[PDB]
Point group: C4
Chain length 103, copies 4
Amino acid sequence: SADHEREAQKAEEELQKVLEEASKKAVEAERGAPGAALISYPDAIWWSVETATTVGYGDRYPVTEEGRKVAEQVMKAGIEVFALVTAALATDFVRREEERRGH
Amino acid sequence: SADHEREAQKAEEELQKVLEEASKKAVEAERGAPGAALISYPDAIWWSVETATTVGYGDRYPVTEEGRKVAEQVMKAGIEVFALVTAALATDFVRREEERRGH
Amino acid sequence: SADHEREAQKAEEELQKVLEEASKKAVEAERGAPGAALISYPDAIWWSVETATTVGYGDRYPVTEEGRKVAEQVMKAGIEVFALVTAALATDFVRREEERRGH
Amino acid sequence: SADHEREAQKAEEELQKVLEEASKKAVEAERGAPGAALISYPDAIWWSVETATTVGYGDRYPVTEEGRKVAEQVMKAGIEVFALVTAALATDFVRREEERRGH
Protein backbone atom coordinates (compact mmCIF):
# COMPACT_ATOMS: atom_id res chain seq x y z
CA SER A 1 0.00 0.00 0.00
CA ALA A 2 1.10 3.59 -0.60
CA ASP A 3 1.76 6.23 2.05
CA HIS A 4 -1.59 7.90 1.37
CA GLU A 5 -3.34 4.53 1.12
CA ARG A 6 -2.05 3.53 4.55
CA GLU A 7 -3.64 6.61 6.06
CA ALA A 8 -7.01 5.68 4.55
CA GLN A 9 -6.68 2.13 5.86
CA LYS A 10 -5.88 3.43 9.35
CA ALA A 11 -9.04 5.56 9.32
CA GLU A 12 -11.16 2.53 8.39
CA GLU A 13 -9.92 0.61 11.44
CA GLU A 14 -10.90 3.53 13.68
CA LEU A 15 -14.50 3.26 12.49
CA GLN A 16 -14.66 -0.37 13.62
CA LYS A 17 -13.69 0.65 17.16
CA VAL A 18 -16.63 3.05 17.29
CA LEU A 19 -19.04 0.26 16.35
CA GLU A 20 -17.97 -1.63 19.45
CA GLU A 21 -18.95 1.37 21.56
CA ALA A 22 -22.10 1.87 19.48
CA SER A 23 -23.13 -1.73 20.13
CA LYS A 24 -22.93 -1.09 23.85
CA LYS A 25 -24.50 2.34 24.38
CA ALA A 26 -27.09 0.92 21.97
CA VAL A 27 -28.25 -1.66 24.53
CA GLU A 28 -28.54 0.96 27.26
CA ALA A 29 -29.79 3.56 24.79
CA GLU A 30 -32.97 1.46 24.64
CA ARG A 31 -33.43 -0.37 27.94
CA GLY A 32 -35.94 2.04 29.51
CA ALA A 33 -37.19 3.98 26.47
CA PRO A 34 -40.85 4.48 25.41
CA GLY A 35 -41.60 2.17 22.49
CA ALA A 36 -38.07 0.72 22.60
CA ALA A 37 -37.16 -1.93 20.02
CA LEU A 38 -33.40 -2.48 20.23
CA ILE A 39 -32.87 -5.09 22.94
CA SER A 40 -30.29 -7.80 23.62
CA TYR A 41 -26.52 -7.44 23.30
CA PRO A 42 -26.00 -10.17 20.57
CA ASP A 43 -28.45 -8.31 18.30
CA ALA A 44 -27.35 -4.80 19.32
CA ILE A 45 -24.04 -5.34 17.53
CA TRP A 46 -25.77 -6.12 14.24
CA TRP A 47 -27.73 -2.87 14.37
CA SER A 48 -24.44 -1.03 14.90
CA VAL A 49 -23.20 -2.46 11.60
CA GLU A 50 -26.08 -1.01 9.54
CA THR A 51 -25.53 2.67 10.32
CA ALA A 52 -21.82 3.54 10.30
CA THR A 53 -21.85 2.96 6.54
CA THR A 54 -24.13 5.98 6.14
CA VAL A 55 -26.97 3.56 5.40
CA GLY A 56 -29.81 3.84 7.91
CA TYR A 57 -32.14 1.24 6.43
CA GLY A 58 -34.28 1.14 9.57
CA ASP A 59 -34.45 -2.20 11.39
CA ARG A 60 -33.88 -0.72 14.85
CA TYR A 61 -33.30 2.86 16.03
CA PRO A 62 -32.90 4.70 19.41
CA VAL A 63 -35.74 6.72 20.92
CA THR A 64 -35.41 10.07 22.74
CA GLU A 65 -35.02 9.42 26.46
CA GLU A 66 -32.00 7.45 25.14
CA GLY A 67 -30.10 10.46 23.95
CA ARG A 68 -31.21 9.97 20.30
CA LYS A 69 -27.80 11.40 19.68
CA VAL A 70 -26.69 7.81 20.36
CA ALA A 71 -27.20 6.93 16.69
CA GLU A 72 -26.38 10.40 15.35
CA GLN A 73 -22.98 10.41 17.05
CA VAL A 74 -22.10 6.94 15.74
CA MET A 75 -23.16 7.73 12.16
CA LYS A 76 -21.18 10.97 12.13
CA ALA A 77 -18.04 9.01 13.03
CA GLY A 78 -18.37 7.15 9.73
CA ILE A 79 -18.75 10.38 7.74
CA GLU A 80 -15.41 11.69 8.97
CA VAL A 81 -13.61 8.40 8.32
CA PHE A 82 -15.10 7.87 4.85
CA ALA A 83 -14.58 11.58 4.15
CA LEU A 84 -10.88 11.53 5.01
CA VAL A 85 -10.12 8.80 2.45
CA THR A 86 -10.43 11.76 0.06
CA ALA A 87 -6.74 12.43 0.60
CA ALA A 88 -6.33 9.17 -1.36
CA LEU A 89 -8.87 10.18 -4.01
CA ALA A 90 -7.46 13.56 -5.08
CA THR A 91 -4.29 11.58 -5.83
CA ASP A 92 -6.12 8.99 -7.93
CA PHE A 93 -5.87 11.08 -11.09
CA VAL A 94 -2.56 12.71 -10.15
CA ARG A 95 -0.90 9.37 -10.93
CA ARG A 96 -1.93 9.92 -14.55
CA GLU A 97 1.26 11.96 -14.96
CA GLU A 98 3.36 9.05 -13.67
CA GLU A 99 1.52 6.66 -15.98
CA ARG A 100 2.41 8.92 -18.91
CA ARG A 101 6.11 8.04 -18.59
CA GLY A 102 5.59 5.05 -16.30
CA HIS A 103 7.52 6.82 -13.55
CA SER B 1 -4.54 27.57 12.78
CA ALA B 2 -4.74 27.21 9.00
CA ASP B 3 -7.46 29.11 7.11
CA HIS B 4 -9.50 26.38 5.40
CA GLU B 5 -10.08 24.52 8.66
CA ARG B 6 -11.94 27.45 10.23
CA GLU B 7 -14.14 27.87 7.16
CA ALA B 8 -15.09 24.20 7.42
CA GLN B 9 -16.03 24.60 11.09
CA LYS B 10 -18.16 27.64 10.25
CA ALA B 11 -20.13 25.59 7.73
CA GLU B 12 -21.04 23.11 10.47
CA GLU B 13 -22.54 25.92 12.54
CA GLU B 14 -24.71 26.92 9.59
CA LEU B 15 -26.22 23.43 9.47
CA GLN B 16 -27.26 23.68 13.12
CA LYS B 17 -29.01 26.99 12.42
CA VAL B 18 -31.13 25.39 9.69
CA LEU B 19 -32.12 22.52 11.97
CA GLU B 20 -33.34 25.04 14.53
CA GLU B 21 -35.33 26.86 11.85
CA ALA B 22 -36.48 23.53 10.43
CA SER B 23 -37.97 22.55 13.79
CA LYS B 24 -40.14 25.67 13.84
CA LYS B 25 -41.48 25.40 10.29
CA ALA B 26 -41.49 21.60 10.52
CA VAL B 27 -44.09 21.63 13.31
CA GLU B 28 -46.16 24.34 11.62
CA ALA B 29 -45.81 22.63 8.25
CA GLU B 30 -47.23 19.43 9.74
CA ARG B 31 -50.14 21.22 11.37
CA GLY B 32 -52.89 20.61 8.80
CA ALA B 33 -51.09 17.83 6.90
CA PRO B 34 -52.59 14.26 6.85
CA GLY B 35 -50.57 11.42 8.39
CA ALA B 36 -48.17 14.03 9.74
CA ALA B 37 -46.94 11.75 12.51
CA LEU B 38 -44.57 14.64 13.30
CA ILE B 39 -45.70 17.22 15.85
CA SER B 40 -44.47 19.06 18.95
CA TYR B 41 -41.46 21.40 19.11
CA PRO B 42 -39.45 19.26 21.64
CA ASP B 43 -39.46 16.31 19.20
CA ALA B 44 -39.29 18.54 16.11
CA ILE B 45 -35.55 19.05 16.53
CA TRP B 46 -35.11 15.30 16.96
CA TRP B 47 -36.55 14.57 13.51
CA SER B 48 -34.64 17.55 12.11
CA VAL B 49 -31.27 16.11 13.14
CA GLU B 50 -31.63 12.93 11.06
CA THR B 51 -33.06 14.99 8.20
CA ALA B 52 -29.87 17.02 7.72
CA THR B 53 -27.96 13.75 7.42
CA THR B 54 -30.52 12.64 4.83
CA VAL B 55 -30.24 9.31 6.64
CA GLY B 56 -33.70 9.58 8.22
CA TYR B 57 -32.95 6.12 9.66
CA GLY B 58 -36.64 5.37 10.20
CA ASP B 59 -37.90 7.63 12.99
CA ARG B 60 -40.45 9.80 11.17
CA TYR B 61 -41.16 11.53 7.86
CA PRO B 62 -43.18 14.59 6.66
CA VAL B 63 -46.11 14.53 4.20
CA THR B 64 -47.04 16.66 1.15
CA GLU B 65 -48.97 19.57 2.65
CA GLU B 66 -46.00 20.38 4.89
CA GLY B 67 -44.43 21.60 1.69
CA ARG B 68 -42.03 18.58 1.39
CA LYS B 69 -39.74 21.33 0.20
CA VAL B 70 -39.35 21.73 3.97
CA ALA B 71 -37.18 18.61 4.15
CA GLU B 72 -35.59 19.08 0.73
CA GLN B 73 -34.19 22.38 1.99
CA VAL B 74 -32.81 20.81 5.17
CA MET B 75 -31.53 17.65 3.46
CA LYS B 76 -29.89 19.67 0.69
CA ALA B 77 -28.44 22.11 3.23
CA GLY B 78 -26.71 19.26 5.06
CA ILE B 79 -25.25 17.78 1.87
CA GLU B 80 -23.78 21.12 0.79
CA VAL B 81 -22.26 21.67 4.23
CA PHE B 82 -20.60 18.25 4.32
CA ALA B 83 -19.31 19.00 0.81
CA LEU B 84 -17.87 22.48 1.31
CA VAL B 85 -15.68 21.17 4.11
CA THR B 86 -13.94 19.52 1.18
CA ALA B 87 -11.92 22.73 1.09
CA ALA B 88 -9.94 21.21 3.97
CA LEU B 89 -9.99 17.66 2.57
CA ALA B 90 -8.91 18.61 -0.95
CA THR B 91 -5.72 19.94 0.63
CA ASP B 92 -5.09 16.72 2.55
CA PHE B 93 -3.16 15.18 -0.34
CA VAL B 94 -1.24 18.42 -0.93
CA ARG B 95 0.38 18.04 2.49
CA ARG B 96 2.44 15.19 1.02
CA GLU B 97 4.46 17.77 -0.92
CA GLU B 98 5.24 19.76 2.23
CA GLU B 99 6.43 16.61 3.99
CA ARG B 100 8.90 15.93 1.18
CA ARG B 101 10.63 19.25 1.80
CA GLY B 102 10.48 18.74 5.56
CA HIS B 103 9.50 22.36 6.19
CA SER C 1 -17.95 34.21 -10.61
CA ALA C 2 -15.77 31.15 -11.18
CA ASP C 3 -16.31 29.12 -14.34
CA HIS C 4 -16.88 26.14 -12.03
CA GLU C 5 -19.77 27.76 -10.14
CA ARG C 6 -21.70 28.48 -13.32
CA GLU C 7 -20.96 25.00 -14.64
CA ALA C 8 -22.03 23.36 -11.39
CA GLN C 9 -25.14 25.55 -11.25
CA LYS C 10 -26.17 24.33 -14.70
CA ALA C 11 -25.91 20.73 -13.51
CA GLU C 12 -28.50 21.46 -10.81
CA GLU C 13 -31.04 22.35 -13.49
CA GLU C 14 -30.38 19.00 -15.17
CA LEU C 15 -31.40 17.18 -11.99
CA GLN C 16 -34.79 18.89 -12.05
CA LYS C 17 -35.37 17.70 -15.62
CA VAL C 18 -35.18 14.05 -14.57
CA LEU C 19 -37.66 14.63 -11.75
CA GLU C 20 -40.16 16.05 -14.24
CA GLU C 21 -39.84 12.98 -16.46
CA ALA C 22 -39.75 10.74 -13.39
CA SER C 23 -42.90 12.31 -11.99
CA LYS C 24 -44.65 11.02 -15.11
CA LYS C 25 -43.20 7.58 -15.89
CA ALA C 26 -43.61 6.91 -12.17
CA VAL C 27 -47.40 7.21 -12.45
CA GLU C 28 -47.56 4.74 -15.32
CA ALA C 29 -44.82 2.52 -13.93
CA GLU C 30 -46.93 2.27 -10.75
CA ARG C 31 -50.39 2.65 -12.27
CA GLY C 32 -51.19 -0.90 -13.39
CA ALA C 33 -48.44 -2.78 -11.54
CA PRO C 34 -49.21 -5.12 -8.57
CA GLY C 35 -48.49 -3.91 -5.04
CA ALA C 36 -48.42 -0.36 -6.40
CA ALA C 37 -49.25 2.46 -3.98
CA LEU C 38 -47.99 5.54 -5.83
CA ILE C 39 -50.70 6.42 -8.35
CA SER C 40 -52.11 9.96 -8.16
CA TYR C 41 -50.57 12.58 -10.47
CA PRO C 42 -50.05 15.54 -8.02
CA ASP C 43 -48.58 13.03 -5.56
CA ALA C 44 -46.18 11.50 -8.09
CA ILE C 45 -44.35 14.82 -8.48
CA TRP C 46 -43.82 15.11 -4.74
CA TRP C 47 -42.34 11.63 -4.68
CA SER C 48 -39.98 12.63 -7.49
CA VAL C 49 -37.92 14.96 -5.28
CA GLU C 50 -36.19 13.67 -2.16
CA THR C 51 -35.56 10.51 -4.17
CA ALA C 52 -33.15 12.32 -6.50
CA THR C 53 -31.04 13.56 -3.58
CA THR C 54 -30.97 9.93 -2.43
CA VAL C 55 -32.34 9.82 1.13
CA GLY C 56 -34.55 6.87 0.19
CA TYR C 57 -37.46 8.49 2.05
CA GLY C 58 -39.33 8.90 -1.23
CA ASP C 59 -42.31 8.25 1.05
CA ARG C 60 -43.15 5.34 -1.25
CA TYR C 61 -41.71 2.09 -2.62
CA PRO C 62 -41.77 0.98 -6.34
CA VAL C 63 -42.12 -2.75 -7.14
CA THR C 64 -40.48 -4.62 -10.05
CA GLU C 65 -42.98 -4.17 -12.92
CA GLU C 66 -42.64 -0.40 -12.51
CA GLY C 67 -39.17 -1.10 -13.86
CA ARG C 68 -37.34 -0.29 -10.55
CA LYS C 69 -34.92 1.27 -12.99
CA VAL C 70 -37.45 4.12 -12.76
CA ALA C 71 -36.16 5.14 -9.32
CA GLU C 72 -32.66 3.71 -9.71
CA GLN C 73 -32.01 5.93 -12.73
CA VAL C 74 -33.41 8.97 -10.91
CA MET C 75 -31.21 8.46 -7.86
CA LYS C 76 -28.11 7.86 -10.00
CA ALA C 77 -28.76 11.07 -11.94
CA GLY C 78 -28.51 12.96 -8.65
CA ILE C 79 -25.13 11.42 -7.87
CA GLU C 80 -23.71 12.55 -11.20
CA VAL C 81 -25.02 16.08 -10.73
CA PHE C 82 -23.96 16.29 -7.08
CA ALA C 83 -20.67 14.57 -7.93
CA LEU C 84 -19.98 16.75 -10.98
CA VAL C 85 -19.78 19.98 -8.97
CA THR C 86 -16.96 18.19 -7.13
CA ALA C 87 -14.81 20.24 -9.49
CA ALA C 88 -15.89 23.53 -7.91
CA LEU C 89 -15.26 21.94 -4.52
CA ALA C 90 -11.66 21.10 -5.41
CA THR C 91 -10.71 24.62 -6.49
CA ASP C 92 -11.84 25.57 -2.97
CA PHE C 93 -8.46 25.21 -1.24
CA VAL C 94 -6.59 26.14 -4.43
CA ARG C 95 -7.68 29.73 -3.69
CA ARG C 96 -5.50 29.59 -0.57
CA GLU C 97 -2.43 29.87 -2.79
CA GLU C 98 -3.63 33.28 -3.93
CA GLU C 99 -4.31 34.28 -0.32
CA ARG C 100 -0.64 33.73 0.48
CA ARG C 101 0.44 36.32 -2.08
CA GLY C 102 -2.74 38.33 -1.54
CA HIS C 103 -3.32 38.39 -5.30
CA SER D 1 -10.73 9.29 -24.82
CA ALA D 2 -9.62 10.39 -21.35
CA ASP D 3 -8.06 7.49 -19.45
CA HIS D 4 -9.90 8.70 -16.35
CA GLU D 5 -13.28 7.77 -17.84
CA ARG D 6 -11.99 4.33 -18.79
CA GLU D 7 -10.89 3.66 -15.21
CA ALA D 8 -14.06 5.15 -13.73
CA GLN D 9 -16.28 3.37 -16.25
CA LYS D 10 -14.47 0.09 -15.59
CA ALA D 11 -15.21 0.37 -11.87
CA GLU D 12 -18.93 0.42 -12.65
CA GLU D 13 -18.60 -2.89 -14.50
CA GLU D 14 -17.29 -4.59 -11.36
CA LEU D 15 -20.27 -3.23 -9.42
CA GLN D 16 -22.69 -5.19 -11.61
CA LYS D 17 -20.73 -8.42 -11.08
CA VAL D 18 -20.98 -8.02 -7.30
CA LEU D 19 -24.75 -7.53 -7.44
CA GLU D 20 -25.11 -10.77 -9.38
CA GLU D 21 -22.97 -12.72 -6.91
CA ALA D 22 -24.38 -10.85 -3.91
CA SER D 23 -27.94 -11.40 -5.13
CA LYS D 24 -27.50 -15.16 -5.01
CA LYS D 25 -26.09 -14.84 -1.50
CA ALA D 26 -28.76 -12.41 -0.28
CA VAL D 27 -31.61 -14.79 -1.10
CA GLU D 28 -29.67 -17.75 0.27
CA ALA D 29 -28.51 -15.76 3.31
CA GLU D 30 -32.07 -14.63 4.01
CA ARG D 31 -33.21 -18.24 3.92
CA GLY D 32 -32.95 -19.95 7.31
CA ALA D 33 -33.05 -16.64 9.18
CA PRO D 34 -35.99 -15.65 11.47
CA GLY D 35 -38.45 -13.07 10.13
CA ALA D 36 -36.94 -13.45 6.66
CA ALA D 37 -38.29 -10.87 4.20
CA LEU D 38 -36.01 -11.32 1.18
CA ILE D 39 -37.01 -14.84 0.10
CA SER D 40 -37.38 -13.86 -3.54
CA TYR D 41 -34.85 -15.11 -6.10
CA PRO D 42 -35.55 -13.32 -9.46
CA ASP D 43 -36.23 -10.13 -7.50
CA ALA D 44 -33.15 -10.68 -5.31
CA ILE D 45 -31.07 -8.67 -7.77
CA TRP D 46 -33.59 -5.83 -7.68
CA TRP D 47 -33.02 -5.41 -3.94
CA SER D 48 -29.28 -5.76 -4.50
CA VAL D 49 -29.35 -3.00 -7.13
CA GLU D 50 -30.73 -0.43 -4.71
CA THR D 51 -28.33 -1.75 -2.08
CA ALA D 52 -25.28 -0.85 -4.20
CA THR D 53 -26.75 2.65 -4.51
CA THR D 54 -26.61 2.81 -0.71
CA VAL D 55 -30.24 3.87 -0.21
CA GLY D 56 -32.35 0.82 0.68
CA TYR D 57 -35.36 3.02 -0.08
CA GLY D 58 -37.64 0.82 2.05
CA ASP D 59 -38.41 -2.31 0.03
CA ARG D 60 -36.83 -5.06 2.13
CA TYR D 61 -34.22 -5.58 4.85
CA PRO D 62 -31.75 -8.40 5.81
CA VAL D 63 -32.03 -10.32 9.09
CA THR D 64 -29.18 -11.34 11.43
CA GLU D 65 -28.46 -14.92 10.33
CA GLU D 66 -28.19 -13.74 6.72
CA GLY D 67 -24.75 -12.63 7.77
CA ARG D 68 -25.78 -8.92 7.56
CA LYS D 69 -22.27 -8.67 6.25
CA VAL D 70 -23.89 -9.87 3.00
CA ALA D 71 -25.81 -6.62 2.59
CA GLU D 72 -23.00 -4.60 4.14
CA GLN D 73 -20.55 -5.97 1.58
CA VAL D 74 -22.62 -4.73 -1.37
CA MET D 75 -22.95 -1.22 0.07
CA LYS D 76 -19.18 -0.87 0.49
CA ALA D 77 -18.59 -2.29 -2.99
CA GLY D 78 -20.73 0.49 -4.46
CA ILE D 79 -18.95 3.19 -2.47
CA GLU D 80 -15.49 2.07 -3.60
CA VAL D 81 -16.31 2.05 -7.31
CA PHE D 82 -18.25 5.33 -7.21
CA ALA D 83 -15.78 6.92 -4.80
CA LEU D 84 -12.96 5.97 -7.15
CA VAL D 85 -14.57 7.93 -9.98
CA THR D 86 -13.56 10.84 -7.76
CA ALA D 87 -10.36 10.71 -9.79
CA ALA D 88 -11.76 11.97 -13.08
CA LEU D 89 -14.00 14.32 -11.11
CA ALA D 90 -11.17 15.66 -8.94
CA THR D 91 -9.27 16.25 -12.16
CA ASP D 92 -12.16 18.42 -13.39
CA PHE D 93 -10.73 21.59 -11.84
CA VAL D 94 -7.30 20.71 -13.26
CA ARG D 95 -8.58 20.90 -16.84
CA ARG D 96 -9.10 24.60 -16.12
CA GLU D 97 -5.42 25.07 -16.96
CA GLU D 98 -5.99 23.86 -20.51
CA GLU D 99 -9.19 25.89 -20.78
CA ARG D 100 -7.38 28.97 -19.51
CA ARG D 101 -4.80 28.68 -22.28
CA GLY D 102 -7.54 28.21 -24.90
CA HIS D 103 -6.15 24.95 -26.27
